[PDB]
Design a protein around this ligand. Structure first.
Ligand SMILES: Cc1cc2nc3c(=O)[nH]c(=O)nc-3n(C[C@H](O)[C@H](O)[C@H](O)COP(=O)(O)OP(=O)(O)OC[C@H]3O[C@@H](n4cnc5c(N)ncnc54)[C@H](O)[C@@H]3O)c2cc1C
Ligand SMILES: Cc1cc2nc3c(=O)[nH]c(=O)nc-3n(C[C@H](O)[C@H](O)[C@H](O)COP(=O)(O)OP(=O)(O)OC[C@H]3O[C@@H](n4cnc5c(N)ncnc54)[C@H](O)[C@@H]3O)c2cc1C
Lengths: 456, 456
C-alpha cells in the first residue's frame, strides 16, 4: 500500500485495524457461511460515520476491492473479500429510541437483538428477521421480513431515512423528502449505493404475543401443508404461521421415537390481544397431531430470540429459494418427498407465508420485488463437516430443481454464492432498469460490488 | 460556564451534546425510575473512550456534579442529576466476541440484550440480570446476578479486565495482574472509582435451557414457599428457582378468575442437558397446584428476554430489599401476609435463591458483600399513577420493616433514593474500609458520588 495514502487514512480513522498478522485476524474474517474462506488485506472496524468516510475513500484511492460487513449473514458470502478491505460495521451498534415519537435511529452495524432490546425497553418494535444475531444492515437493505411483517410490513416499509456514505466519500441523507431516488433504491437494492451508517424507523406498540411451536409427523404432512395453505389465503393480518420441515430435535418435549426423523415444525403467533391469540392459535394447531407442543405468552423480544429450536449454529450452509404465487398439490407432494431426505440436523426446508401488509404496498413503491407472491420456500441446507459439502448442497439443489417451475423470482437476501446471475430475474426488468440509473448516479465506478450486484 | 474550558471540551468531544433548551432534553434526561425528575446542566452522549475522558475532565475543571448513565436502571435515580453533567454512555454499545477464546469485550453503555445477542451468535454466554434492557454498566459494577449465576457466579466472577477513566482524566486497565486494588474495588464497588468504558468477560457454552413458569394460589403459599426453601438448600448448581409474588397477569394461560389476584409466580430453569432439566423441573413444579404452566426448551437468549410475564414496563418504582441467611416458617407467613396486600399489577415481592457458585468465591476476593447469604427478598413496588406514590411506597416500606428481624445486608443495586445511609450495612465494616482506601487513591475528591457512595 501507499504510505502517504495509508497515513491519510490513519489520520482520519478512529476505529480499529486488523491486519493479516494480528491475533484476531482469522476470527474476524470468518462469516456465518463457513464455506466462504477468504483473506482480506485489511479489516477496518469503523466506530463512526467519519470512520466509514475515511475507509471508503482509502479503499477508492488504494484500489482495494470493497466488502462491507454488517452482521456477516450473507448467504452468498459477500461480507468478506480476498485481498481487499472489509469495511466492518460490527462496532457501530448504537440505537437511540424515542418513546414519545415511536422512532428508533440505529447504526448500520446493529444486530437485530440489539435493536429489539432497545425498542422493547419502551414496549415498541418494528419488523425484522427471526434470528437475533442477523445484521440489521444487510437484512433491511434487502427488504427484511419476520414475525411482525403480516401486520406492519417489511423492515423497509417502516424505514423513514438513512445516512449513507457514497463511493466518492460524501455523506448523504436519503428519505421521502431528500434524495428520494436513492431512498427508493436502498429500500431493497442492497449495499449497491453506498454504506448505510444510520437507519431511522417508525415503531409500533407491541405487547405480549401469544405463540406456539409444535411438530407434526411427516405422514400427516399432506393434510398439514394443505390446511396451512388454505388457511393463510384468508387469514387476518394478525396471524403469522410458518412451517419448517426438518429433523426433529432431541428435546424432552418430543417423543424419543421422533428424535432425528423428518417432521414439520410449525410456529405461529398472533400480533394482538393474547386471549384472541389463544383462540386463533388453537384453531390452527390440530390439522395434525401436535407433538412437542409449546405455547407461551411472550414479550416480543423473547419471540425474536426464540428461533430456532435446538439453538445450534451450523458451520456451513447452502440455500436455494424462491417465491410462489400458489402452492399446488404437486408442489406440496414435492416438498414432502424432499423433506423426507433431509440428512443434517441443521437443515430446514422453510415454507413462509407473507402477504398481509407486505402485499398492500404498491409493487412500484420500493426496490423490493415480489410483494404479490405470498409463499416463500427456502431450502436452507446447513451442516458441520466440510467433507459432507456435496451431499447437503445436492439436497437443496435437487429440491429446488424439482420445484423450479412453480417458483418465480427470488429474495436477494437468500441468494447463494453461485447465483450472481439471478439478479435480473429477481428484480424484474422495470426495477432492474431503475436500479441501474440510480447506480450510475451514485456508484458509477461500481466500487460497491460485493452484493447482489447491479452494474451501472 | 467559562468559555475556555467549554471550547476545549468541544475540540476533543466527538459525541453529541444535549442542552436544556434543546427539544430532546426532556426525553434524554428521563431514567427508568420515573419518580426521579431532575434537570442537568448538560447531557454528553459519549461515543468512545476519548469522549469519556473529555467529559470527565470537563466536569472536573468545571466543578459540575457528575452523573454517569449506562442503561438508566438505577433504582436510586443516580444516573441523572440536578444542575450537573450527565456522562451518558448509551451510544457505547459495541461487543466483540471471540468464539475460540470464549471472550467478550463490551463497551460500558451496553444493554444486556445486546450483549446476550452477541455472545449467543456463538452459543456462548456469561451471567447477567434477567431483564434485557438493563445496562451492563451499573449491573456489573454492583456484582450482577441472574439465571446463570448459580452455575457460573456473579457477572463480576467472569470479569477479567476493565478499561476505566479515573477522576483525574486518566485511562487505566485494571485486571488480576494490573492495578489489582482497583480491579477488586470495581467488582462490586459501583461507579465509585471511575467510568468503565470496556468490560472483558470469560464466556461459557450455554445450549438450550429447559424452563418453566407457573402460578400458585396464595391458598397454597405456605406449602410452596416451604418446599422452595427446603429444596434449594441442597439443590445442584444447575437448578435455579425463583418466586415472584404478584397480582396474576391477565394472560390466557391463567383462568380469568385468577387475573388480578395475588399469586406466586414461580420461574425455574436447568442449566445443562434439557432431558435432565425436564426431570428436575417436574421434581419442583408440584409443591402446589400449578396454574398457567408454561414449559419450554429455550435458547439462552430467549430465557434472558422472557422476564417478566405481561411485558409491561412501569413508569414509577420504589424498592426495599435485603438478604436472608435463613427463611423461617414465620418469615414465610409475613411474606405471604404482605403479598396479599399488593395493589399494583406491576409490583412484585421477589424471593431469590443465590448460593451455588456465588458462595464458593471467598468473601474477600471481590468488593461484593453477602456471598454467604443465599436468600434475597426484593419488595419491588411499581406503578403508573403519580398521585399514587404514597400507597405503593408504603407497601414496600412496611413489608421491609415487618421482615426486619430476618433481613441483613443489602444489594447496592436494589437501593432506593432514600437509602444513602445503608452503604455501611450493605458492605460490612471491613469491605467498606478497604473501598475507602481505594477511593482515597483513585477518586480522592469524590468526583463520582452519584452511586452507593463510598466517601474517601
Ligand atoms: C440464520 C439467518 C436467519 C435469517 N433470517 C432472516 C429473516 O427472518 N428475514 C429476512 O428477511 N432475512 C433473514 N436472513 C437473511 C438476511 O437478511 C441476509 O443474510 C442479510 O444479507 C443479512 O445481513 P447481514 O448484515 O447480517 O449480512 P452481511 O453479510 O454483513 O451483509 C449482507 C450484504 O449487505 C451489505 N451490507 C450490510 N450492512 C450494510 C450497511 N450498513 N450498508 C451497506 N451495505 C451493507 C453487505 O455489503 C452485503 O452485500 C437470515 C439470515 C440468516 C443467516
Ligand atoms: C427492571 C430491572 C431489572 C433488574 N434485574 C436485575 C437482575 O436480574 N440482576 C441484578 O443483579 N440487578 C438487576 N437490576 C438492578 C441493576 O443491576 C441496577 O439497577 C443497576 O445499577 C442498573 O445499571 P444501569 O447501567 O442500567 O443503571 P444506571 O442508572 O445507568 O447506573 C447505575 C449506577 O452505575 C453507574 N454506572 C453505570 N454504568 C457505568 C459505567 N460504565 N461506568 C461507571 N459507572 C457506571 C451509575 O453512575 C450509577 O451509580 C434490575 C433493575 C431493573 C430496573
Amino acid at each position: 500500500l501507499d504510505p502517504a495514502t495509508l497515513a491519510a487514512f490513519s489520520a482520519a480513522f478512529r476505529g480499529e485495524l486488523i491486519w493479516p498478522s494480528d491475533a484476531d485476524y482469522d476470527e474476524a474474517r470468518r462469516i456465518w457461511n463457513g464455506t466462504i474462506d477468504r483473506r482480506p488485506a485489511l479489516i477496518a472496524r469503523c466506530t463512526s460515520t467519519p470512520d466509514v468516510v475515511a475507509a471508503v475513500s482509502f479503499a477508492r484511492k488504494s484500489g482495494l476491492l470493497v466488502a462491507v460487513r454488517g452482521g456477516g449473514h450473507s448467504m452468498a458470502g459477500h461480507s468478506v473479500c480476498d485481498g481487499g478491505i472489509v469495511i466492518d460495521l460490527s462496532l457501530m451498534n448504537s440505537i437511540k429510541v424515542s418513546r414519545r415519537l415511536r422512532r428508533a435511529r440505529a447504526q448500520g452495524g446493529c444486530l437485530l437483538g440489539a435493536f429489539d432490546t432497545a425498542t422493547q425497553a419502551h414496549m415498541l418494535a418494528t419488523p425484522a428477521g427471526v434470528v437475533s444475531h442477523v445484521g440489521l444492515g444487510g437484512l433491511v437493505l434487502g427488504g427484511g421480513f419476520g414475525w411482525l411483517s403480516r401486520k406492519y410490513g417489511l423492515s423497509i416499509d417502516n424505514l423513514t431515512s438513512v445516512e449513507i456514505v457514497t463511493a466518492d466519500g460524501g455523506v448523504l441523507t436519503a428519505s421521502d423528502t431528500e434524495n428520494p431516488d436513492l431512498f427508493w433504491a436502498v429500500r431493497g437494492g442492497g449495499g449497491n449505493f453506498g454504506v448505510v451508517t444510520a437507519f431511522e424507523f417508525d415503531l409500533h406498540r407491541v405487547g405480549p404475543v401469544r405463540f406456539a411451536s409444535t411438530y407434526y409427523s411427516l405422514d400427516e404432512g399432506p393434510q398439514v401443508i394443505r390446511a396451512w395453505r388454505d388457511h393463510m389465503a384468508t387469514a387476518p393480518d394478525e396471524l403469522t404461521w410458518a412451517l419448517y420441515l426438518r429433523l426433529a430435535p432431541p428435546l424432552p418435549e418430543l417423543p424419543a421415537d421422533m428424535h432425528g426423523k423428518p417432521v414439520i415444525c410449525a410456529m405461529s403467533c398472533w400480533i394482538g390481544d393474547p386471549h384472541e391469540g389463544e383462540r386463533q392459535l388453537e384453531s390452527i394447531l390440530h390439522a395434525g397431531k401436535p407433538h412437542g407442543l409449546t405455547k407461551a405468552t411472550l414479550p416480543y423480544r423473547a419471540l425474536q430470540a426464540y428461533s430456532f429450536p435446538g439453538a445450534v449454529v451450523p458451520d456451513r450452509i447452502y440455500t436455494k429459494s424462491g417465491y410462489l404465487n400458489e402452492l399446488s398439490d404437486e408442489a406440496t407432494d414435492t416438498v414432502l418427498e424432499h423433506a423426507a431426505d433431509i440428512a443434517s440436523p441443521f437443515t430446514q426446508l422453510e415454507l413462509l407465508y407473507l402477504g398481509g401488509a407486505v402485499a398492500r404496498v404498491p409493487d412500484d413503491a420500493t426496490a423490493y420485488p415480489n410483494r404479490q407472491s405470498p409463499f416463500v420456500t427456502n431450502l436452507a441446507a446447513a451442516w458441520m463437516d466440510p467433507t459432507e459439502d456435496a451431499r447437503h448442497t445436492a439436497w437443496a439443489r435437487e429440491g429446488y430443481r424439482a420445484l423450479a417451475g412453480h417458483l418465480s423470482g427470488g429474495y436477494v437476501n437468500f441468494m447463494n454464492p453461485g447465483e450472481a446471475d439471478r439478479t435480473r430475474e429477481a428484480y424484474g426488468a422495470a426495477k432492474f432498469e431503475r436500479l441501474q440509473g440510480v447506480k450510475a448516479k451514485y456508484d458509477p465506478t461500481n466500487l460497491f460490488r460485493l452484493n447482489q450486484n447491479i452494474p451501472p
